[PDB]
Amino acid sequence: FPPNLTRRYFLYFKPLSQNCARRYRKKAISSKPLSVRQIKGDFLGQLITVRGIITRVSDVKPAVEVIAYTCDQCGYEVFQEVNTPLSECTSEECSQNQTKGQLFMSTRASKFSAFQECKISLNIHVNGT
Amino acid sequence: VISIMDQTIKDCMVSLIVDNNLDYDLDEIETKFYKVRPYNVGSCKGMRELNPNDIDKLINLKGLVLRSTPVIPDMKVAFFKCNVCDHTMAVEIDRGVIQEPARCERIDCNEPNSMSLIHNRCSFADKQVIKLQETPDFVPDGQTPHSISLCVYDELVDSCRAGDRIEVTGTFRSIPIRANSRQRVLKSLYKTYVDVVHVKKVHNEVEEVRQITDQDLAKIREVAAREDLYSLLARSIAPSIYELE
C-alpha cells in the first residue's frame, strides 16, 4: 500500500508573523509580503508570500492521486501514484499462467483530492481543505 | 446496491406468480431485466458541495435544465462477420472493452485477422447529454452559478426540455480525459458526470407529493378560519412600508 493512500490529512505551512520576524535576523524574506514582479529566478521552490487580488476563481475539481487498477482474472489492485494508464497486470499470477488480464480502473478504490485554480498574473493551485 | 435490488425484485416477481397460480408464460417474465430507479433521498447536496470523497454516490440534485443535446448512440453488443466464410458473430461489450476475436470460430475457416466489424448490425443504446444549471435560490450572493453534465439512458430520454425544474437523483461517476486525440495519455483531471437514474419534475407520472408538514396544515386552516385574513396578510407582506393598504 502506498503511503499517500492512507494520508487523509493535508499538511500546511503557516508563515511567521511580524512579531517573531523582528527577533530573527537570518533571512527574513518569508515573512515579508512580496509582489509578483519581485519573484526572480532564485525563488523557485521557496516558501514566499504573494499579495494581490484573486481573479478568475474556478470551481472545485476532484484531482486523483493514487489510481488503483482492479484486474478481472487474478483480481489484484495495482496502485500507481500521479505526480499513461496501466493496461497489463504486473502481478505474479498473470505472469506465471501466461494470461495477461485487462486492468480495469476502479473509481471507488482511487483516492481523489480537491483542486482549484486561482489567478492573483500568477496561477495559484489550492489543494485540500 | 442497485445491482442487488435488480435481483431481489426478480425473485419477488416469481413468488407472486406461484402464489396466484396464473396461466402465464414464465419464460417471458424471467428474461425481462427489471431496473430500480431510486429518487428523493436525504443527501441533497448541491454542485458546490461536491466533495471528492463522494465518488460513485447517489446524490440528489435540484437544478434547472439549460440546453438539450440530440440522442447519441452507444454501442452495447458488437457484431462481427468473416470475410472468407461469412460467419456472423455477436460479442457483447464488457466495461467498454470490445474483445475482438483473433481467429474464426469455424473449423473450415480458422484464419487469423479475418473478422470484419459491421457497425450497422450492432445493438446501440440511447444516450442523451443534458446541461443542468444551478438553482439561484441556493447560490450565495456574489457568486456565479456553475453547470454540470448529465447522462440519461434507458427509455428516460427526450423527457426534459429547456426551462423545466426537475430533480436529478443519480450516481456521481467520473470519466478520465485524454491529453491528446492520437496518444493514449491521460490528464490529472477527471471529468465528472452524474448518471441520471430517475427524473422527478417539480414518461410515467407523479402519484402524490408529501411536502411541508401536516402539523403546519393545522396552523394554515387556523388562520383561514379567522375573518381578518385580508388584513393580516396585507401587513405581513410589507411591514417596513406604512400605509399603501
Short mmCIF file of C-alpha atoms in Angstrom, two decimals:
data_model
loop_
_atom_site.label_atom_id
_atom_site.label_comp_id
_atom_site.label_asym_id
_atom_site.label_seq_id
_atom_site.Cartn_x
_atom_site.Cartn_y
_atom_site.Cartn_z
CA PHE A 1 0.00 0.00 0.00
CA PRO A 2 1.29 3.46 -0.91
CA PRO A 3 1.75 5.98 1.92
CA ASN A 4 -0.27 8.65 0.10
CA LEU A 5 -3.41 6.47 0.09
CA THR A 6 -3.61 6.34 3.90
CA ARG A 7 -2.73 10.03 4.46
CA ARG A 8 -6.14 11.64 4.99
CA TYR A 9 -4.74 14.91 6.37
CA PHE A 10 -3.40 17.90 4.42
CA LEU A 11 -0.24 19.34 5.95
CA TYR A 12 0.16 23.12 5.69
CA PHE A 13 2.94 25.59 6.49
CA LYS A 14 1.96 28.88 8.14
CA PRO A 15 4.45 31.73 7.63
CA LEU A 16 6.00 33.61 10.52
CA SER A 17 4.30 36.69 11.93
CA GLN A 18 5.70 40.22 12.04
CA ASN A 19 6.49 39.96 15.77
CA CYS A 20 8.66 36.83 15.60
CA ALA A 21 10.43 38.01 12.43
CA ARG A 22 11.94 41.05 14.18
CA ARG A 23 13.94 38.95 16.66
CA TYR A 24 15.19 36.56 13.94
CA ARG A 25 17.96 38.23 11.91
CA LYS A 26 18.64 35.39 9.45
CA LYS A 27 16.98 35.96 6.06
CA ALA A 28 13.54 37.38 6.94
CA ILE A 29 12.12 37.18 3.42
CA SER A 30 9.38 34.58 4.00
CA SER A 31 7.61 36.93 6.44
CA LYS A 32 7.59 39.93 4.07
CA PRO A 33 4.64 40.15 1.64
CA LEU A 34 6.43 40.09 -1.71
CA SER A 35 4.84 41.03 -5.03
CA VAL A 36 4.56 39.22 -8.36
CA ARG A 37 7.22 41.27 -10.16
CA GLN A 38 9.73 40.68 -7.33
CA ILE A 39 9.73 36.91 -7.98
CA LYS A 40 13.10 36.29 -9.64
CA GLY A 41 14.79 33.04 -10.68
CA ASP A 42 16.18 32.23 -7.22
CA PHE A 43 12.76 31.97 -5.53
CA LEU A 44 11.87 28.66 -7.19
CA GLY A 45 10.75 26.10 -4.62
CA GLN A 46 10.87 28.62 -1.76
CA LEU A 47 8.12 29.48 0.73
CA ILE A 48 7.39 33.08 -0.25
CA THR A 49 4.36 35.35 0.25
CA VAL A 50 2.35 36.78 -2.66
CA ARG A 51 0.00 39.71 -2.03
CA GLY A 52 -2.59 40.68 -4.61
CA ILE A 53 -6.18 40.36 -5.78
CA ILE A 54 -7.63 36.93 -6.56
CA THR A 55 -9.18 36.96 -10.04
CA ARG A 56 -10.97 34.28 -12.06
CA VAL A 57 -11.94 31.80 -9.33
CA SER A 58 -12.50 28.34 -10.79
CA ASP A 59 -14.70 25.56 -9.46
CA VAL A 60 -13.73 22.68 -7.16
CA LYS A 61 -12.48 19.82 -9.34
CA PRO A 62 -11.52 16.48 -7.72
CA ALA A 63 -7.94 15.53 -8.59
CA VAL A 64 -6.83 11.91 -8.31
CA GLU A 65 -3.56 10.93 -6.64
CA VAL A 66 -3.27 7.13 -6.48
CA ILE A 67 -5.01 5.22 -9.27
CA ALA A 68 -5.87 1.60 -8.45
CA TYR A 69 -6.37 -0.88 -11.30
CA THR A 70 -8.56 -3.88 -10.43
CA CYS A 71 -7.87 -6.91 -12.61
CA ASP A 72 -10.53 -9.32 -13.84
CA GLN A 73 -8.61 -12.64 -13.82
CA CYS A 74 -6.42 -12.53 -10.70
CA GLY A 75 -8.28 -9.63 -9.09
CA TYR A 76 -5.29 -7.65 -7.79
CA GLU A 77 -5.23 -3.90 -7.13
CA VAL A 78 -2.24 -2.22 -8.80
CA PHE A 79 -1.68 1.20 -7.24
CA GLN A 80 0.02 3.94 -9.26
CA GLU A 81 0.90 7.40 -7.96
CA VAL A 82 0.35 10.51 -10.07
CA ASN A 83 2.98 13.25 -9.87
CA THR A 84 -0.49 6.80 -19.05
CA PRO A 85 -2.90 4.23 -17.61
CA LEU A 86 -1.66 0.71 -16.95
CA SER A 87 -3.19 -1.99 -19.17
CA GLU A 88 -1.06 -5.08 -18.47
CA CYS A 89 -1.17 -6.58 -14.99
CA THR A 90 2.12 -6.74 -13.08
CA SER A 91 1.04 -9.46 -10.64
CA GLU A 92 2.78 -12.83 -10.35
CA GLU A 93 -0.42 -14.77 -11.05
CA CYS A 94 -0.86 -13.28 -14.53
CA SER A 95 2.81 -13.80 -15.47
CA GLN A 96 3.15 -17.44 -14.41
CA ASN A 97 -0.09 -18.51 -16.13
CA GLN A 98 0.77 -16.59 -19.34
CA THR A 99 -2.61 -14.82 -19.20
CA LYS A 100 -2.26 -11.02 -19.14
CA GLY A 101 -5.55 -9.75 -17.76
CA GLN A 102 -7.03 -6.38 -18.65
CA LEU A 103 -6.58 -3.90 -15.80
CA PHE A 104 -9.82 -2.05 -15.03
CA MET A 105 -9.56 1.33 -13.33
CA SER A 106 -11.68 1.37 -10.16
CA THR A 107 -13.03 4.82 -9.31
CA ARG A 108 -14.04 3.78 -5.78
CA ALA A 109 -10.55 2.43 -4.99
CA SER A 110 -8.78 5.61 -6.14
CA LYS A 111 -8.17 8.49 -3.72
CA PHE A 112 -9.21 11.90 -5.06
CA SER A 113 -8.17 15.27 -3.62
CA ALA A 114 -9.53 18.77 -4.10
CA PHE A 115 -8.06 21.07 -6.75
CA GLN A 116 -8.91 24.69 -7.55
CA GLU A 117 -7.24 27.14 -9.94
CA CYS A 118 -6.88 30.80 -8.99
CA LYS A 119 -5.13 33.79 -10.56
CA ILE A 120 -3.61 36.58 -8.48
CA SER A 121 -0.80 37.29 -13.25
CA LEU A 122 0.18 34.12 -11.38
CA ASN A 123 -1.68 30.81 -11.25
CA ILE A 124 -2.41 29.53 -7.73
CA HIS A 125 -3.40 25.89 -7.20
CA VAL A 126 -5.32 25.25 -3.97
CA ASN A 127 -5.34 21.65 -2.73
CA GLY A 128 -7.05 20.19 0.32
CA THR A 129 -9.47 21.75 2.80
CA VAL B 1 -26.54 -1.84 -4.13
CA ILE B 2 -28.63 -1.22 -7.26
CA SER B 3 -27.40 -4.50 -8.75
CA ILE B 4 -28.72 -6.30 -5.66
CA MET B 5 -32.12 -4.59 -5.90
CA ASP B 6 -32.37 -5.66 -9.55
CA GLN B 7 -32.01 -9.31 -8.49
CA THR B 8 -34.27 -9.20 -5.41
CA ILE B 9 -37.08 -7.70 -7.49
CA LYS B 10 -36.79 -10.65 -9.89
CA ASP B 11 -37.22 -13.34 -7.23
CA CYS B 12 -40.19 -11.47 -5.73
CA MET B 13 -41.92 -11.44 -9.13
CA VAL B 14 -41.71 -15.22 -9.46
CA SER B 15 -43.09 -15.70 -5.93
CA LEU B 16 -46.17 -13.64 -6.85
CA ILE B 17 -46.97 -15.92 -9.80
CA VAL B 18 -46.85 -19.15 -7.77
CA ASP B 19 -48.94 -17.57 -5.00
CA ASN B 20 -51.57 -16.51 -7.56
CA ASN B 21 -51.37 -19.60 -9.83
CA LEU B 22 -51.85 -17.85 -13.17
CA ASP B 23 -51.61 -19.35 -16.65
CA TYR B 24 -48.93 -17.01 -17.97
CA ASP B 25 -45.61 -17.59 -19.72
CA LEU B 26 -42.94 -17.80 -17.01
CA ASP B 27 -40.07 -17.62 -19.53
CA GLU B 28 -41.15 -14.21 -20.86
CA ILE B 29 -41.14 -12.69 -17.36
CA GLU B 30 -37.86 -14.12 -16.06
CA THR B 31 -35.98 -12.99 -19.18
CA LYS B 32 -37.07 -9.37 -18.70
CA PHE B 33 -34.42 -7.44 -16.75
CA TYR B 34 -36.09 -5.18 -14.18
CA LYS B 35 -34.38 -1.98 -13.03
CA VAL B 36 -34.89 0.04 -9.84
CA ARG B 37 -34.94 3.85 -10.01
CA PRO B 38 -34.38 5.33 -6.54
CA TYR B 39 -35.04 9.02 -6.01
CA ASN B 40 -35.87 11.62 -3.35
CA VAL B 41 -33.03 10.91 -0.93
CA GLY B 42 -31.91 12.85 2.14
CA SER B 43 -28.48 13.79 0.79
CA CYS B 44 -29.50 16.92 -1.12
CA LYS B 45 -26.02 18.29 -1.77
CA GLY B 46 -25.56 20.98 -4.39
CA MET B 47 -22.97 21.31 -7.13
CA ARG B 48 -20.65 23.39 -4.93
CA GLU B 49 -20.64 20.88 -2.05
CA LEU B 50 -19.45 18.02 -4.31
CA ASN B 51 -16.69 16.71 -2.08
CA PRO B 52 -14.04 14.47 -3.70
CA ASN B 53 -14.82 11.58 -1.32
CA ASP B 54 -18.31 11.20 -2.87
CA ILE B 55 -17.07 9.10 -5.80
CA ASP B 56 -19.87 6.87 -7.14
CA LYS B 57 -22.56 8.08 -4.73
CA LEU B 58 -26.23 8.78 -5.41
CA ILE B 59 -26.69 12.49 -4.63
CA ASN B 60 -29.94 14.29 -5.38
CA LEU B 61 -29.59 17.49 -7.42
CA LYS B 62 -32.17 20.28 -7.64
CA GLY B 63 -31.27 22.45 -10.63
CA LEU B 64 -32.71 23.73 -13.89
CA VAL B 65 -32.31 22.44 -17.44
CA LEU B 66 -30.33 24.82 -19.66
CA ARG B 67 -29.99 23.20 -23.10
CA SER B 68 -30.68 19.84 -24.74
CA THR B 69 -28.44 17.67 -26.93
CA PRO B 70 -29.58 15.12 -29.53
CA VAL B 71 -29.53 11.40 -28.77
CA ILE B 72 -26.07 9.88 -29.20
CA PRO B 73 -25.94 6.14 -29.99
CA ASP B 74 -23.95 3.99 -27.57
CA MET B 75 -22.78 0.58 -28.76
CA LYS B 76 -23.63 -2.32 -26.44
CA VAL B 77 -23.33 -5.56 -28.44
CA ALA B 78 -20.73 -5.70 -31.20
CA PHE B 79 -21.33 -7.54 -34.47
CA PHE B 80 -18.54 -9.36 -36.32
CA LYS B 81 -18.55 -11.12 -39.69
CA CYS B 82 -15.85 -13.06 -41.52
CA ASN B 83 -14.62 -12.04 -44.97
CA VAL B 84 -13.95 -15.58 -46.26
CA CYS B 85 -16.64 -17.96 -44.96
CA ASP B 86 -19.08 -15.19 -43.90
CA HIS B 87 -19.59 -16.26 -40.28
CA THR B 88 -21.70 -13.77 -38.34
CA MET B 89 -20.90 -13.46 -34.63
CA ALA B 90 -22.24 -11.46 -31.68
CA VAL B 91 -19.75 -10.38 -28.99
CA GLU B 92 -21.02 -8.23 -26.13
CA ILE B 93 -19.03 -5.29 -24.77
CA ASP B 94 -17.95 -5.59 -21.13
CA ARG B 95 -16.89 -2.43 -19.26
CA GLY B 96 -16.40 -0.58 -22.54
CA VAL B 97 -13.94 -3.20 -23.85
CA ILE B 98 -14.59 -4.67 -27.30
CA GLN B 99 -12.79 -8.04 -27.25
CA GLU B 100 -12.34 -8.74 -30.95
CA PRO B 101 -11.83 -12.41 -31.92
CA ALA B 102 -8.33 -13.26 -33.13
CA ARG B 103 -9.34 -16.37 -35.11
CA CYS B 104 -12.57 -17.56 -36.68
CA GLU B 105 -14.79 -19.96 -34.75
CA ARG B 106 -15.49 -22.06 -37.86
CA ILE B 107 -13.45 -25.22 -38.31
CA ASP B 108 -13.37 -24.94 -42.11
CA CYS B 109 -12.07 -21.36 -41.91
CA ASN B 110 -9.74 -20.73 -38.95
CA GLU B 111 -7.97 -17.70 -40.41
CA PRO B 112 -6.32 -15.06 -38.19
CA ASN B 113 -7.29 -11.41 -38.74
CA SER B 114 -10.28 -12.22 -40.96
CA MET B 115 -13.21 -10.85 -38.91
CA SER B 116 -14.83 -7.58 -40.01
CA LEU B 117 -16.71 -5.31 -37.62
CA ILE B 118 -20.08 -4.21 -39.02
CA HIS B 119 -21.36 -1.17 -37.13
CA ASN B 120 -24.69 -1.24 -38.99
CA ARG B 121 -25.72 -4.54 -37.34
CA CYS B 122 -24.91 -3.63 -33.71
CA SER B 123 -27.37 -3.07 -30.87
CA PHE B 124 -26.99 0.58 -29.88
CA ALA B 125 -28.22 2.22 -26.68
CA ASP B 126 -29.81 5.62 -26.10
CA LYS B 127 -27.57 8.27 -24.52
CA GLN B 128 -28.53 11.92 -24.03
CA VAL B 129 -26.46 14.74 -22.51
CA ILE B 130 -28.40 17.37 -20.55
CA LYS B 131 -26.74 20.53 -19.22
CA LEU B 132 -28.16 21.38 -15.79
CA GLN B 133 -27.84 24.85 -14.27
CA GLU B 134 -27.69 25.54 -10.55
CA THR B 135 -30.75 26.96 -8.83
CA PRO B 136 -30.34 30.68 -7.98
CA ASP B 137 -32.15 30.12 -4.66
CA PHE B 138 -29.15 28.16 -3.32
CA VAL B 139 -26.32 30.14 -4.96
CA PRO B 140 -24.80 32.61 -2.46
CA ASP B 141 -24.67 36.32 -3.19
CA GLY B 142 -21.64 37.36 -5.23
CA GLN B 143 -21.02 34.02 -6.96
CA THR B 144 -21.88 32.75 -10.43
CA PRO B 145 -23.93 29.55 -10.80
CA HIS B 146 -21.97 26.76 -12.46
CA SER B 147 -23.18 23.83 -14.57
CA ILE B 148 -22.76 20.06 -14.78
CA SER B 149 -23.17 17.27 -17.33
CA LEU B 150 -25.89 14.63 -17.05
CA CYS B 151 -26.15 11.22 -18.73
CA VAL B 152 -29.62 9.82 -19.44
CA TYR B 153 -30.01 6.20 -20.53
CA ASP B 154 -32.75 3.55 -20.94
CA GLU B 155 -36.11 4.98 -22.06
CA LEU B 156 -35.86 8.19 -20.00
CA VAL B 157 -34.50 10.24 -22.92
CA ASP B 158 -36.49 13.08 -24.51
CA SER B 159 -38.22 13.90 -21.22
CA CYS B 160 -36.53 17.14 -20.08
CA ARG B 161 -36.93 20.36 -22.07
CA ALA B 162 -35.23 23.73 -21.73
CA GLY B 163 -36.70 25.75 -18.87
CA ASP B 164 -38.03 22.91 -16.71
CA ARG B 165 -37.40 22.36 -12.99
CA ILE B 166 -36.57 18.69 -12.42
CA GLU B 167 -34.91 16.69 -9.62
CA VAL B 168 -31.96 14.51 -10.68
CA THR B 169 -31.09 11.86 -8.06
CA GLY B 170 -28.39 9.69 -9.64
CA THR B 171 -24.88 8.45 -9.01
CA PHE B 172 -21.85 10.75 -9.18
CA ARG B 173 -19.41 8.99 -11.51
CA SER B 174 -16.31 10.29 -13.28
CA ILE B 175 -14.52 9.55 -16.55
CA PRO B 176 -10.87 10.37 -17.35
CA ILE B 177 -9.85 12.69 -20.17
CA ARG B 178 -7.06 12.31 -22.71
CA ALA B 179 -4.37 14.93 -23.26
CA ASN B 180 -4.11 14.15 -26.99
CA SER B 181 -6.52 12.72 -29.55
CA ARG B 182 -3.80 10.47 -31.03
CA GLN B 183 -1.97 9.33 -27.88
CA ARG B 184 -3.09 7.10 -25.01
CA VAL B 185 -2.01 9.50 -22.26
CA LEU B 186 -4.42 10.84 -19.64
CA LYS B 187 -4.51 14.12 -17.73
CA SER B 188 -4.59 14.51 -13.95
CA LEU B 189 -8.10 15.98 -14.00
CA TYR B 190 -11.17 13.73 -14.27
CA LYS B 191 -14.37 14.82 -16.00
CA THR B 192 -17.23 14.50 -13.51
CA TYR B 193 -20.70 13.49 -14.69
CA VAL B 194 -23.94 12.50 -12.96
CA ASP B 195 -25.67 9.39 -14.32
CA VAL B 196 -29.41 10.14 -14.33
CA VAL B 197 -31.49 7.36 -12.80
CA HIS B 198 -34.90 8.96 -12.17
CA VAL B 199 -36.50 12.21 -13.34
CA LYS B 200 -38.90 13.88 -10.90
CA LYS B 201 -40.37 17.10 -12.28
CA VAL B 202 -41.05 19.93 -9.84
CA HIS B 203 -42.67 9.04 -19.05
CA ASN B 204 -44.81 7.96 -16.08
CA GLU B 205 -46.31 10.50 -13.66
CA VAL B 206 -46.10 11.56 -10.02
CA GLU B 207 -48.74 9.73 -7.98
CA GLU B 208 -48.63 12.05 -4.95
CA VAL B 209 -46.45 14.55 -3.09
CA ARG B 210 -45.52 14.77 0.59
CA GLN B 211 -44.42 18.37 1.02
CA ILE B 212 -44.38 20.55 4.18
CA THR B 213 -45.81 19.01 7.37
CA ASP B 214 -49.30 18.03 8.48
CA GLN B 215 -48.74 19.94 11.73
CA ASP B 216 -48.30 23.13 9.70
CA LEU B 217 -51.57 22.44 7.86
CA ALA B 218 -53.48 22.83 11.13
CA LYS B 219 -51.97 26.29 11.57
CA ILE B 220 -52.84 27.13 7.96
CA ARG B 221 -56.51 26.28 8.48
CA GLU B 222 -56.46 28.22 11.76
CA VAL B 223 -55.61 31.49 10.01
CA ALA B 224 -58.08 30.69 7.23
CA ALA B 225 -60.91 30.44 9.77
CA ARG B 226 -60.20 33.98 11.01
CA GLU B 227 -62.13 36.85 9.44
CA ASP B 228 -59.09 39.18 9.48
CA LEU B 229 -57.16 37.27 6.80
CA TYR B 230 -57.28 40.06 4.21
CA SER B 231 -55.73 42.50 6.71
CA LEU B 232 -53.17 40.19 8.34
CA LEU B 233 -51.57 39.08 5.06
CA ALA B 234 -51.52 42.66 3.75
CA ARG B 235 -49.41 43.85 6.70
CA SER B 236 -47.00 40.89 6.73
CA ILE B 237 -46.16 41.28 3.03
CA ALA B 238 -44.50 44.66 3.74
CA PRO B 239 -44.12 45.65 7.42
CA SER B 240 -41.48 48.29 6.56
CA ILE B 241 -43.77 50.41 4.33
CA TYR B 242 -46.50 52.46 6.01
CA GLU B 243 -49.99 52.98 4.55
CA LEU B 244 -50.42 51.71 0.96
CA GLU B 245 -53.25 49.42 2.04
#
